[PDB]
Design a protein around this ligand. Structure first.
Ligand SMILES: */C=C/C(=O)Oc1ccccc1Nc1nc(Nc2ccc(N3CCN(C)CC3)cc2)ncc1Cl
Length: 288
């Protein structure tokens, strides 16, 4: 199930970020790997539940998992997090509508795999760009298990017995986020409960100007208050797969620069960052 490696073979190179446990970069067996060491006795019991599930998981769009001190040797993602690509430190990279749709497609593919596992369906819950990593020039997306109110479905923080349709709600928000390149619910701000109150009362991110109706339809359905009215992840994957015909160029690495300017979208309607001109063009060739 999992390869057993000791700290002697590992070679720690440099620190990365600050998760729940602290993450460090390393090189083991001629492979770059990210390691999440524990520095607490209380946090060791989290490993016991997670290692049973994470060992069984194996998917292209999910992070791969390759003992004293207790650690998890995972594969290193050169591209960083999706949040950093979208809103991070300058210089920000350029990306197109093809990349945005491809990221969401690969994300739905990974979550569908988790939903369909046996015996029980694994729910990710905390699905958000900071946990979506990128590799291969920012073209392949990788999900990683373990202020999230902006991506959290209303029924979750309400305390109701949530289902796996809470991930579908998160995906909907992420779809709005990559198309607009805006932080969802940034204008609200404040503490977390002020966003929860908004989402609970029906507030959603503003509509996007010149957005294709099929994309607008899938996005809003994912936003619906009733979890049963949201589509399954299998449905999202299938729809997103057939839409990519009209979004070529998703394998092109991110290498061109982008200078950050954000116009304030007034009148409850925002401009998209990506451009859909090529989509409407290719859509006309097939349809008429
Ligand atoms: C996958 C769940 C998770 O928590 O991943 C995170 C989140 C935050 C920090 C670290 C990790 N673990 C991790 N990281 C990587 N690669 C990677 C490489 C670079 C970065 N940074 C780029 C520079 N800025 C300044 C900060 C972010 C982040 C992550 N690969 C695999 C894992 Cl498990």
């Amino acid at each position: 199930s999992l390869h057993m490696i000791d700290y002697k073979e590992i070679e720690v190179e440099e620190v990365v970020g600050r998760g729940a446990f602290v993450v460090c970069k390393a090189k083991w067996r001629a492979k770059d790997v990210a390691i999440k060491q524990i520095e607490s006795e209380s946090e060791r019991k989290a490993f016991i539940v997670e290692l049973r599930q994470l060992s069984r998981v194996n998917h292209p769009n999910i992070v791969k998992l390759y003992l004293n001190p207790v650690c998890l040797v995972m594969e290193y993602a050169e591209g960083g997090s999706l949040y950093n690509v979208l809103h991070g430190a300058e210089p920000l990279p350029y990306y197109t509508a093809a990349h945005a749709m491809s990221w969401c497609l690969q994300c739905s593919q990974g979550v569908a795999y988790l939903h369909s596992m046996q015996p029980k369906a694994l729910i990710h819950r905390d699905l958000k760009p900071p946990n979506l990593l990128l590799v291969a020039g920012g073209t392949v997306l990788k999900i990683c298990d373990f202020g999230s109110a902006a991506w959290m479905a209303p029924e979750v923080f309400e305390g109701s017995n949530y289902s796996e349709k809470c991930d579908v709600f998160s995906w909907g928000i992420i779809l709005w986020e990559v198309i607009t390149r805006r932080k969802p619910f940034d204008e609200i701000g404040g503490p977390a409960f002020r966003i929860m109150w908004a989402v609970h009362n029906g507030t959603r991110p503003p509509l996007i100007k010149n957005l294709p109706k099929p994309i607008e339809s899938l996005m809003t359905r994912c936003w619906s208050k009733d979890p049963s009215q949201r589509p399954s992840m299998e449905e999202i994957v299938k729809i997103m797969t057939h839409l990519m015909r009209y979004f070529p160029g998703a394998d092109e690495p991110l290498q061109y620069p982008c200078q950050h300017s954000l116009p304030p979208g007034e009148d409850g309607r925002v401009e998209p960052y990506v451009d859909f001109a090529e989509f409407y063009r290719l859509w006309s060739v097939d349809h008429g």
